[PDB]
Amino acid sequence: NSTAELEELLMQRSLTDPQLQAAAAAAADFRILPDATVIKIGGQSVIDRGRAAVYPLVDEIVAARKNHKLLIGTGAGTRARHLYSIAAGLGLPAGVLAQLGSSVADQNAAMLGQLLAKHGIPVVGGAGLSAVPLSLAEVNAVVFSGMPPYKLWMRPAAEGVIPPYRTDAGCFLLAEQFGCKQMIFVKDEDGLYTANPKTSKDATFIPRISVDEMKAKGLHDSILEFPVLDLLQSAQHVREVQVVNGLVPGNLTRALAGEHVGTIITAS
Amino acid sequence: NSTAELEELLMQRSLTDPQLQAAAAAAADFRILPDATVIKIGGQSVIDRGRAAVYPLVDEIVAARKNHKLLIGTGAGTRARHLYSIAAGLGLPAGVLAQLGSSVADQNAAMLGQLLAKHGIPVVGGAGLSAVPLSLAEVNAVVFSGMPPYKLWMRPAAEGVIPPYRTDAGCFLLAEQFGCKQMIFVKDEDGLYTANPKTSKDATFIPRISVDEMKAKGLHDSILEFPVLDLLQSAQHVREVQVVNGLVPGNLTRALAGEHVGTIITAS
Amino acid sequence: NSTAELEELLMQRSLTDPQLQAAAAAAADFRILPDATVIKIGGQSVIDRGRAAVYPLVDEIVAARKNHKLLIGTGAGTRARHLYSIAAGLGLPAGVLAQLGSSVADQNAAMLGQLLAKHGIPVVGGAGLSAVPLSLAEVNAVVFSGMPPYKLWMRPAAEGVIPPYRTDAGCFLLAEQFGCKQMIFVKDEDGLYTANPKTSKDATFIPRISVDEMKAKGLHDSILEFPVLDLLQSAQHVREVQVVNGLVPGNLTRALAGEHVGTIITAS
Amino acid sequence: KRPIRLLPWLQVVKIGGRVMDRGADAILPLVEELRKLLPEHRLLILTGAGVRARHVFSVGLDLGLPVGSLAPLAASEAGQNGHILAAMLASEGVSYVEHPTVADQLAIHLSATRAVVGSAFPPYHHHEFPGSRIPPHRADTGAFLLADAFGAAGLTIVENVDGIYTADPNGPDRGQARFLPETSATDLAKSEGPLPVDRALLDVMATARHIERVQVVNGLVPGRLTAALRGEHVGTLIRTGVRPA
Amino acid sequence: KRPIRLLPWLQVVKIGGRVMDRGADAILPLVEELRKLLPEHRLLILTGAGVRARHVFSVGLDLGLPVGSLAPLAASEAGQNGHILAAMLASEGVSYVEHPTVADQLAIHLSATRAVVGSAFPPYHHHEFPGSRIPPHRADTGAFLLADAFGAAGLTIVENVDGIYTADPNGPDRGQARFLPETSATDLAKSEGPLPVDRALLDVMATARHIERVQVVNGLVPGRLTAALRGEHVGTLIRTGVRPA
Amino acid sequence: KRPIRLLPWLQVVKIGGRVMDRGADAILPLVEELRKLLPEHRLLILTGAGVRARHVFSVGLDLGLPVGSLAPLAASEAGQNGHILAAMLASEGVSYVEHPTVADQLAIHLSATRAVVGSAFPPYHHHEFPGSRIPPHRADTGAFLLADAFGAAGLTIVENVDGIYTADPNGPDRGQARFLPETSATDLAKSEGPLPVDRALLDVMATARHIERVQVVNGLVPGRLTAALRGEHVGTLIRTGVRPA
Numbered sequence A, B, C: 001n002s003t004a005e006l007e008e009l010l011m012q013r014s015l016t017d018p019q020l021q022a023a024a025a026a027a028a029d030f031r032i033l034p035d036a037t038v039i040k041i042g043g044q045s046v047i048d049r050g051r052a053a054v055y056p057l058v059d060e061i062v063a064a065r066k067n068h069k070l071l072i073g074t075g076a077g078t079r080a081r082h083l084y085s086i087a088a089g090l091g092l093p094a095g096v097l098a099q100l101g102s103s104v105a106d107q108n109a110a111m112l113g114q115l116l117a118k119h120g121i122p123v124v125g126g127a128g129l130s131a132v133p134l135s136l137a138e139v140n141a142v143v144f145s146g147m148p149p150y151k152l153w154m155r156p157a158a159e160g161v162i163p164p165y166r167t168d169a170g171c172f173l174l175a176e177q178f179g180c181k182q183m184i185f186v187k188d189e190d191g192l193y194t195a196n197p198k199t200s201k202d203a204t205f206i207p208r209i210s211v212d213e214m215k216a217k218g219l220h221d222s223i224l225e226f227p228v229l230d231l232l233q234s235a236q237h238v239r240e241v242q243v244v245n246g247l248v249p250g251n252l253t254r255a256l257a258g259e260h261v262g263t264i265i266t267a268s
Numbered sequence D, E, F: 001k002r003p004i005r006l007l008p009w010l011q012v013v014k015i016g017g018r019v020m021d022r023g024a025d026a027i028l029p030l031v032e033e034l035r036k037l038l039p040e041h042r043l044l045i046l047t048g049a050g051v052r053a054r055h056v057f058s059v060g061l062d063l064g065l066p067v068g069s070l071a072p073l074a075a076s077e078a079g080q081n082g083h084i085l086a087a088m089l090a091s092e093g094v095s096y097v098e099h100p101t102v103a104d105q106l107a108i109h110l111s112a113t114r115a116v117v118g119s120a121f122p123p124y125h126h127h128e129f130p131g132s133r134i135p136p137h138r139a140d141t142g143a144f145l146l147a148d149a150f151g152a153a154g155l156t157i158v159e160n161v162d163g164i165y166t167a168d169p170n171g172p173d174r175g176q177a178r179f180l181p182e183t184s185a186t187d188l189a190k191s192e193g194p195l196p197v198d199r200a201l202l203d204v205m206a207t208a209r210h211i212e213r214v215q216v217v218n219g220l221v222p223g224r225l226t227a228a229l230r231g232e233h234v235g236t237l238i239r240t241g242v243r244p245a
């Protein structure tokens, strides 16, 4: 291998050539924001619940950013399910639904952002994104909308028009892109169970599990969007994620401190 | 009342329903930027006068921001009156005049911004507005253009095509929206008098007055745009404003320090 | 002269009137960012070379910004020469080539920006430019793309369609506009020689030279874009520039420290 | 003189958000009626917000947010309704256009194509007026400000009811509710109960310069929008109080 | 039911970056052929990136940058190719339009004029998928996602070779390379060698909703693009696996 | 070869800011003349800045600001004049379009509608050249750079005087002022007095690739702009020094 053998392959072959693909795999690996943590705040599980859920999390973010650099992404929730229902009933394709859902995650980032403004924390992704480096350096946190940018170019699911990559996937990919040290999903249950705990009375709590074990137990599409599990197995930087209950006071803070609250899902 | 009784009204009635309007009035009241002060720098009374007026105010802003968070909005002035004259003579409506005047307040914010850049203070509202939280936290001040965004959707006055909501109203509404602690209009007279002091030789100075008293004395449209007085009476957060002479060295600084310079106009 | 004699000329004459031109020349001279240095990082001479060239310069920028405010502009390089070749062969005019080359300088600013993000340093010019004052105050450096904004309004050269104002000129004009104290071009040779050192074996090193002396020796278009020499002679603020080898470890740092490395080119 | 009319040939149609909320059963017939109208009129179609704005008001008010924060949050839902309606009309050359485009380039866009869709909410945003915790300048109000500023030939408001009644006809007093074929902005403004239009609409009607009447009609009955755009009386007429030149 | 077709009358044409890389000798005849096509079809012309993306991948990989950083860097080169091609067609009323405009206002733009040009790369950007160090969702993939989302009448891919072979026909095994007049996305996806199309294209074909076949043709032979847009078989047909309603 | 012409059928018209400064008495007849021209030509109408730029130069120079700060401040006034003129032509399908749109999508916009309006000032902004404290690349200069880059059929400059004289005809030497029916950029550039056109215009004429002559005419005399767009000699002709192919 060499800077030169890669450059010759890159000039002489299709990007599909297994030979070129293999030389590229050997390249150096730079992490852009290695000391940051990405947190997803659920739309339906947290923000839709209003101040009883949101105010304690705002207080935690404000306290936690003294010691931890944070990128806080928002989910969408019930207004996006309403939009998907209307648009699906009209026969609109997954790519149009994807744009509609983004607007809802944007609303939620605006609302969270207004509660955090007096602490110096901006909402970003609007005007820019190199908003992010300066913000992280000075106030240690930023708020972003969690939907991926695919919009009309969204790959559809095998069945149905609901966009398969939504705000769990958007936040995960950003953590992965930037080479962040940790990805925490904030939801409204303690973590993963053997069955939906809202719907099933004798579900058992699962502290740690791999993607393969989740699939073997039928949990592919339970507490996280199922494509996130596959993205996790391909990831270069973020090879596990943590799911925690945002409705328990202090839970986010304890996860940032290294406590094993919730469920840890590992790529292998 | 309850989070639940409001939500049922909000689902079941028109937003015009007096019943729903009354439940909403009982909601919590969050101030977004409670520790900041909004200052309007007059276009005709200050910036059009050039460096004899502007340079001492730049020095005050730089000194004052060490102890005071500032949002500094610009007025428009003589170039906007020129544009209004041309556009009115053509029969153009108030909404088109509103766009033209905004451009002039933008020019003035750019000029002020360039004098403040080496002190770290940005002009914002261009690319964003969540420019504001980060800027306020790090350099304690930002410059914005003072025209409201209504543009073509400007409500016209009862008579004539001059936009009734201009830069006094733009700055006031921002202070009110963000729940700021203080709103200071910087002009070229010591404060309110019983008559226009430029035009009337025996006008008397008025240190403090309510909107209702101003109306009873025919001062509805004297030193402030008259709709500002009505906006002030409806305000939730900013229930008085202060008018001071920007041409007196130190006057802005003393107003920020709590000194009763100029005129205080109260909602009631 | 007076604030008033200038204003009467400005009202009464064409901007072409020699009389008005002369009154304007007597105006005060404000420097917007007097304590900053503009650095151009060459596209072909540095960034195209990859990490052996770029990583040591990233480390220098990070160290140097502790004591020096920096605006770091990027050149374009081999991908822009490719684009110019394709577009020239089609008969496209200089103004269209100018837009194509800007995209390449943008790519290079993005790549450099990603290596600097974890140090707090943003890429700007994307969303704004009053990005610049806040960034300079808080992290002491920003990255921008070095192409001028002329695009389709580019003045063409006397012969051929290659845009004559490219990234040397873009960076120079910004330094000049903002009244910066120093302009450093980072290239891949020690400085100016009496002949192209890549092509000529007995070229002699030139430590210091004026524009007029460069022209008399046939060096008008050697290590800098030749219109930069003419811009330098008209400049109000930046009346000399320094050219240094970015491939020598520490060279940029030593130039920022006042060491006479490389070549100094003076307006007179 | 009153100001000139910028786009005297324009027809403006505002589609209530609660019509959109009914889904395909309401939208498909409305879209078919709009398709048939494209060769007859030059149309600016503006969508309201509907029930999702009520949800984001519930969340925002529970978080304590001021009226200048709620206003852009509601406006986003009017925007989404506009994107949905434009997508259904894409094959006819219709797209959604943003507010800046509406304000500055509507004439070139209606030269390019027969209709465009935009949001009815006005850009008051964080500069919304204080007093009520509910944003006053909403979709009816924004559509009328625009139509009147342009000096448009008309504004027609398309709702999920026949027009204005003396009481909410879906409300607890609906037995007492009498239909009003015709009324004035000034009479309405003096009444106290709920209405199917913004109360701010009645205020901006009092300062209007061009538009003399606005018809409110039922978009759930095919044909009424078509008839109203020809001046036929099939809902409630609102007289603005503009008197002719 | 499958979703509706938004722009059923649209034809999408993707122009490979390496066609553009050949300069005037390839571009001038392609531009003359496109000029003759404008009155026959409603065209969205999308450009790929070509060799400059390979250069910025070489630099970016040497700097260690992740796949979400390389993706927008390549996309910029597809953008530049689009500006070059649109400039050559300006006198015919054709311009380059940005992605947001493609996604939301393509219908009004193709009402205004007969064709527009945009970038074939999709906006995955910093949210590109991990796994390979080379961005997988490139120009073929982006053009197909778009064409299928719109329910377009077709997607034709214009390359610098006759179609797909059993081996790279410019490669060290070119003597063994057999031409494939017809094939399926599923058969292709099981093979291991290089192809003239993104491997991700075959994946998005498996989830496609509307487009049943995609033809790959040689843009260096005048007339082939014209013939392909009429459904004539002059390159390699790829069956997507969409089955009819 | 010289470069190709991008929009060979385009006519560019630059309207001086001081024409606009005269208000309705000058603007209404100019707008009526432009209305009559729309079916005859494909027009890019570009506005200059006029007296408000002189005011913002007075303020900016008193504050000490450099020439790269004054340039965008003047350009804003050219922009406002453009919005005013476009509003008067809205009912004819004309709107103001921003510089990025002019540079990249003018062809689709002149396919959509018969004329658009933009700012004549070029985007030199903070990268304006040093030397004079007054921005050199102003409205005449910007309009010519654009017209020549596009390879337009012509540029006509519409001013408040009959053309170029040997002295300012509104100046203290006006008794000595002789009218010049014809002249060259090179002769002009050697003279020292004031002119009704930017001195930078004469410089960009020396490097021009396509446009051979520019006519300066009096927009206060109805009919002169119409005659000039047909090549009739009714003002001062300026020969650029482009020689034919």
Ligand SMILES: Nc1ncnc2c1ncn2[C@@H]1O[C@H](COP(=O)(O)OP(=O)(O)OP(=O)(O)O)[C@@H](O)[C@H]1O
Binding pocket: A041, A042, A043, A044, A045, A046, A074, A075, A076, A077, A078, A166, A167, A168, A186, A187, A188, A189, A191, A192, A193, A194, A195, A196, A197, A198, A219, A221, A222, A223, A224, A225
């Ligand atoms: N096996 C399981 N273990 C735990 N929770 C489960 C399981 N299966 C389903 N769930 C449900 O997953 C929900 C949380 O995921 P969900 O995506 O709904 O929240 P969210 O992140 O707020 O979504 P959005 O942000 O998209 O609105 C829980 O409320 C729980 O009821």
Ligand SMILES: Nc1ncnc2c1ncn2[C@@H]1O[C@H](COP(=O)(O)OP(=O)(O)OP(=O)(O)O)[C@@H](O)[C@H]1O
Binding pocket: B041, B042, B043, B044, B045, B046, B074, B075, B076, B077, B078, B166, B167, B168, B186, B187, B188, B189, B191, B192, B193, B194, B195, B196, B197, B198, B219, B221, B222, B223, B224, B225
């Ligand atoms: N009764 C009064 N008391 C004091 N000042 C008055 C009174 N009536 C009129 N004025 C005039 O109000 C002027 C200040 O208001 P004005 O809005 O003109 O300034 P401004 O804020 O610079 O405006 P803009 O920013 O819109 O240019 C004073 O110069 C004064 O002459």
Ligand SMILES: Nc1ncnc2c1ncn2[C@@H]1O[C@H](COP(=O)(O)OP(=O)(O)OP(=O)(O)O)[C@@H](O)[C@H]1O
Binding pocket: C041, C042, C043, C044, C045, C046, C074, C075, C076, C077, C078, C166, C167, C168, C186, C187, C188, C189, C191, C192, C193, C194, C195, C196, C197, C198, C219, C221, C222, C223, C224, C225
């Ligand atoms: N007389 C000379 N002295 C020194 N270098 C010279 C001379 N004449 C030509 N050069 C060449 O100038 C080159 C540097 O200028 P160049 O503009 O190519 O670099 P750059 O700033 O990277 O360009 P870009 O950023 O536009 O890619 C050197 O590599 C050197 O070979």
Ligand SMILES: Nc1ncnc2c1ncn2[C@@H]1O[C@H](COP(=O)(O)OP(=O)(O)OP(=O)(O)O)[C@@H](O)[C@H]1O
Binding pocket: B013, B014, B015, D015, D016, D017, D018, D019, D047, D048, D049, D050, D053, D138, D139, D140, D159, D160, D161, D163, D164, D165, D166, D167, D168, D169, D170, D171, D193, D194, D195, D196, D197
């Ligand atoms: N006096 C009245 N006459 C008619 N309808 C009334 C009256 N008072 C209340 N309403 C109610 O107004 C409802 C319309 O609700 P609203 O007007 O909020 O919806 P919309 O106009 O579709 O919403 P948006 O303003 O977001 O476009 C009708 O369904 C009716 O029940």
Ligand SMILES: Nc1ncnc2c1ncn2[C@@H]1O[C@H](COP(=O)(O)OP(=O)(O)OP(=O)(O)O)[C@@H](O)[C@H]1O
Binding pocket: A013, A014, A015, E015, E016, E017, E018, E019, E047, E048, E049, E050, E053, E138, E139, E140, E159, E160, E161, E163, E164, E165, E166, E167, E168, E169, E170, E171, E193, E194, E195, E196, E197
């Ligand atoms: N099985 C195959 N059949 C045909 N061509 C192949 C095959 N494998 C590799 N190739 C090569 O693919 C080349 C096309 O390269 P590529 O497909 O990257 O260019 P492009 O499509 O123009 O680029 P872009 O994707 O940026 O638009 C052909 O020139 C050919 O040499």
Ligand SMILES: Nc1ncnc2c1ncn2[C@@H]1O[C@H](COP(=O)(O)OP(=O)(O)OP(=O)(O)O)[C@@H](O)[C@H]1O
Binding pocket: C013, C014, C015, F015, F016, F017, F018, F019, F047, F048, F049, F050, F053, F138, F139, F140, F159, F160, F161, F163, F164, F165, F166, F167, F168, F169, F170, F171, F193, F194, F195, F196, F197
């Ligand atoms: N030699 C000359 N011949 C003709 N007019 C001259 C000459 N010298 C000066 N002028 C003056 O130039 C004036 C035009 O002013 P100017 O050219 O600045 O306005 P404009 O072109 O309308 O402005 P802008 O450049 O902002 O569009 C004429 O009114 C005339 O008085």
Ligand SMILES: [Mg+2]
Binding pocket: D016, D140, D196, D197, D198
């Ligand atoms: Mg309503």
Ligand SMILES: [Mg+2]
Binding pocket: E016, E140, E196, E197, E198
């Ligand atoms: Mg390919």
Ligand SMILES: [Mg+2]
Binding pocket: F016, F140, F196, F197, F198
């Ligand atoms: Mg002039």
Ligand SMILES: [Mo]
Binding pocket: A122, A124, A130, A131, A132, A134, A135, B130, B131, B134
């Ligand atoms: Mo930021």
Ligand SMILES: [Mo]
Binding pocket: A131, B131, C131
């Ligand atoms: Mo920022």
Ligand SMILES: [Mo]
Binding pocket: B122, B124, B130, B131, B132, B134, B135, C130, C131, C134
């Ligand atoms: Mo900022």
Ligand SMILES: [Mo]
Binding pocket: A131, A134, A135, B131, B134, B135, C131, C134, C135
């Ligand atoms: Mo910032």
Ligand SMILES: [Mo]
Binding pocket: A130, A131, A134, C122, C124, C130, C131, C132, C134, C135
């Ligand atoms: Mo920034």
Ligand SMILES: [Mo]
Binding pocket: D098, D100, D101
């Ligand atoms: Mo826009």
Ligand SMILES: [Mo]
Binding pocket: D100, F098
């Ligand atoms: Mo725009």
